[PDB]
């Protein structure tokens, strides 16, 4: 019945389309653009003859027309032996003035949907772009040569309508359609309408509201002169596919085809295929838990040395895994209170925006973001605040300023008060407690990022990441010793900082000093000359180690000078490990050979001043 | 009773619950026999040979062998013990898969500290360690002091059910009566009677909680309204024996018997976290020893064992998860020595200490990395060292 009732609206019965309310389109060029005439590809007869009936049908529809242009472009045959035509308009698309794609991404277009309307109706428009006319000024632009080598017919043609392959067409169509349907939006409130270029989704409350709205909408499309696909349409259904997103009963999955386009491209290895493997996955980042931390190893191959290691082969595989395990997301409903759980690790934020479904929480999104460098330098509980802050900013886009109950593994509401600089920016949109609120401290699933039944202060901190660990990079092996007891007269006073083979650094000290201050002065000095070369420092004296390894302790002792120099001198090399190996210095493996050498340097090369 | 020597025994229970749950055999091959104090020995000998005839009828070859050899194993073991000692006898026998394939009879039999009514016997495909972990529910005697202008209460919170002891009040003047004296003549009488009241608090706490040798109460918590919740902490009018046993100082209003019940409710978490707070105090005093340069400390493996055999070491402080093992062998040239490895080319060393700390030294305390001072102890000093009695050279 639907086809008989709307004869004009359906492509199979209503014939060709033509947007009657849209004036022909002039196409602005760049000032520096000129006509470009490309040699047409010499084509096979098997291909050329296979193309002709498609071109013949366009001429008869007035769409293509003969011309004599200084522009030209080629004609590429494509594809079983059923060769259809393609133009390739790269050399034009270079020369044409760009317009701004005002179009917002598919997902956040869908984010303008409520679950109040669970009766859907999807359409798509056949040969859409061709319904927009081309102003005769612009027609010559899109010229291309055609021939018949069994008829002598070697001449030029061009488009009266908007072609297929011109860069701005989707955008230009979108604006035009938007305008045409603003009329329909105004005279039909209550319904929701979603468009992106050549796809339409009509949401309704009951089946009755949908049927009437659909009828109205179709009647309009015929009036406007756009033609909908009778085959691929979806009329008055609870479950519907749209823009690669499967909708059903207030939920939102990815259609397997939308997965497949990401799943069905090989390991890129080129910077373009890699950049556009990330590009394509970008629409699906809202289903991936912790996409920011997952996608870390690949962002350095944006722009480069293309070393595809195990860490990146893993990261590329975690994504497909996450895509294969992509869950249902709920549409944001906007009446209930929302609940954003959050976590951070390795400079990467990650979290989930959810809300109540019965006594359950059904996620609405998976929001993640990398902490910017200044914040990534901060301590744990700080970087937990930043992450909450960042995800809260983004969540706001989906919440539309509605009730929001934050959660985290470190309860950091008290921290908002006392920061001993950058917090004015955060505290603004955290402690504005009309919209925002905190909630119970809680652990999360590495996998789902949902809460676990599991119950600290934020009043702490002092020391770095110092260990008793010969670090795996194995950089400078430096053995430190000193000497301030008396021998054959008076107190010697001498330091040394050697290695297994060389001498590196050494000196004498003042006549005074102490007995064991020498060892400190040598170690301080050994720790000055180091910065971005890792270092592991061996100590012969055991007083030196402990005081120096504790950490870093503030006080409320009668030797502050050397000490307060040492305490501050330790923040200098990135990743340090103070070890102490007199085990044994008397001696000799591939280790204590250099300990021996530091002990022989600080005694001999010490009696000079 | 030493609350420190007990905490290592309870550690050795926690490690037996880890290892018995880990090991698992094949079919009905695992006996979990627990004997109380009061029940006779030949009664159990009779109850085992009872089950030997009930395990003759089984009819399933390999596990029938396993039960008969294991009930034959426990009867030989139980015969070498004449009746029951004053705590009881806990037992675990069965065959299980170890490393490299192989078979392994475990054979456990010992005396814990009081399972009085615990009478359990279960044969199964895995052991049953529910009764041992029932020994680790023991919330100790926890002390309470609450002070207010009107009066003071003294009492005890032993787990959940609450107790109260001495209700005493001491008068001190309120407001400012500006009669026939001067402005400041009452200010002097305020500190006078407050400091009098604080001394009386100090002496009354000294009497009831201590008892005599060893402090009755395992830990204390303080609470108050005015300077009473500052005055007592800073000034050591409070120190006499029990000051070291103090957990945390609580802030409260009311100050009567309903102050008591705010304090117990704000201090439920801290009383259950004895080990964590006591850990951070014990690591606390270790680090203070290095700060004062008072040379009563040591660290690392070879320095510790030196302090052990010398018997300088008062208190040994070791991380529960020490990767190190100790080793003792016949070698080449028929001799006997001790190596202690870290990385691969007997038992754990933490396990060895747990048993033999009493021998030379001789005090042990087990520590964790969860504590932020414990974390420092671990990754900084390799999780081994201790409190000594005097100055030591080494090098």
Author numbering:
A (entry chain A): 24 to 102, 106 to 329, 332 to 448, 455 to 489, 499 to 599, 611 to 663
B (entry chain B): 5 to 349, 371 to 420
The publication says:
Previously, we showed that MoMLV utilized its RT to interact with host eRF1, thereby promoting stop codon read-through to make Gag–Pol19. In eukaryotes, stop codon recognition is initiated by the binding of the essential termination factor eRF1 in complex with a guanosine triphosphate (GTP)-bound eRF3 to the ribosome. Our structure shows that the MoMLV RT interacts with the C-terminal domain of eRF1 via its RNase H domain. Structure-guided functional assays suggest that MoMLV RT suppresses translation termination by outcompeting eRF3 for binding to eRF1.
The catalytic residues (D524, E562, D583 and D653) of RNase H are distant from the bound eRF1. Structural superposition of MoMLV and HIV RTs based on the polymerase domain showed that MoMLV RNase H swings 92° to a completely different position, accompanied by a moderate movement of thumb and connection subdomains. This movement is conferred by a 32 amino acid linker region between the connection and RNase H domains of MoMLV RT, whereas this loop region is not found in HIV RT and is relatively short in other genera of retroviruses. Intriguingly, we observe an interface between the RT polymerase domain and eRF1 within the crystal lattice in our MoMLV RT/eRF1 structure, but only between symmetry-related molecules. We postulate that this observation may only be due to the crystal packing, because the electron density of this interface is not well defined, indicating a certain degree of disorder in this area. Structural superposition of MoMLV RT/eRF1 and eRF1/eRF3 complexes showed that eRF1 interacts with both MoMLV RT and eRF3 through overlapping surface regions, suggesting that MoMLV RT and eRF3 are mutually exclusive for binding to eRF1.
